[PDB]
């Protein structure tokens, strides 16, 4: 659990770029500006509903360690709907918006993945919500979110897939 | 250091996701397998060029701690990439693949970093080299990859803001 003196600096830099006034916590006002910098237009009321979710205290605002915990919580939250998304690109082979059995069926064993085709009929069956046959976004997000499983090492080898093809490409 | 057995079964699938026969090693033909699966549909030389830019030992295959050295390569230059290229969104406030003198001293004030009149000249003079006035991608992405040190400070947050732009969404 080291901590190098730079990526310190970081944090230090991704606080200062809200605490304005640089008292050392984040009012709403501070958030907002921010926020409408990048693009959202958040209500009083919106904002309000980021800081609960950190505020340890309760006191209101965000200090530092609040702050750390959020910024954590959203680069997770962030770089995971990154790479379900490249996944569901990369199987998504048409880009009709489905995943086809077909497709993957063929991804996962072009792969060298070795899936028996019932363990890849058993994954669509689970997966498909509606039971169109098919995986849509929705559905594959859902998969990848949720006993006896081994369904966890299929979800490892997803992940895995997205974060290369993000890297990569 | 700081490392756990969740880094270390990530790194495993991903090795695995190359070493379709795993047999300890990546071959310039599976670097490429991979690759097509991916998206991309690199050359030849572009396989090599690849391992070789890692290949310590120089066998012509990659081994795993090789391969983790093309990792951190590739998560570094992507992670980059993407933080440079949302604070130029961020910048580029009507979205004319420029930014003009006004705009960056607007997102610069809104958000709380100084730079005075003088300060966002010299910045703009330095990134222009085309002589138009302004400054498009490419200067942009030179300006952030580099007399006082005080160039070093506005970069800093130049980079905390493409950091936060993307983890907010
Ligand atoms: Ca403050
Ligand atoms: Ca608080
Ligand atoms: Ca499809
Ligand atoms: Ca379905
Ligand atoms: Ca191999
Ligand atoms: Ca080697
Ligand atoms: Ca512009
Ligand atoms: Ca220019």
Redesign the interface.
């Known amino acids: 659990?080291?901590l190098t003196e730079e990526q310190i600096?970081?944090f230090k830099?991704?606080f200062?770029?809200?605490?304005?006034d640089?008292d050392g916590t984040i009012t709403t006002k501070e958030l907002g500006?921010?926020?409408?910098?990048?693009?959202?237009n958040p209500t009083e009321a919106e904002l309000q509903d980021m800081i609960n979710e950190v505020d340890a205290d309760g006191n209101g605002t965000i200090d530092f360690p609040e702050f750390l915990t959020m910024?954590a919580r959203?680069?997770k939250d962030?770089d995971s709907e990154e790479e379900i998304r490249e996944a569901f690109?990369?199987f998504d082979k048409d880009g009709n918006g489905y995943i086809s059995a077909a497709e993957l069926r063929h991804?996962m064993t072009?792969?060298?993945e070795k899936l028996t085709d019932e363990e890849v009929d058993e994954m669509i069956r689970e997966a498909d919500i509606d039971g169109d046959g098919q995986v849509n976004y929705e559905e594959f997000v859902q998969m990848m979110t949720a006993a006896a499983a081994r369904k966890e090492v299929i979800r490892?080898?997803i992940?895995?897939?997205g974060?290369?093809?993000?890297?990569?490409?």
Do not use: C, H, P, Y
């Open positions: 659990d080291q600096a970081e830099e991704a200062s770029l809200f605490d304005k640089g500006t921010v926020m409408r910098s990048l693009g959202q910024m959203k680069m962030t690109r990369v991804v072009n792969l060298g490892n080898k992940r895995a897939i974060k290369m093809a993000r890297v990569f490409s």
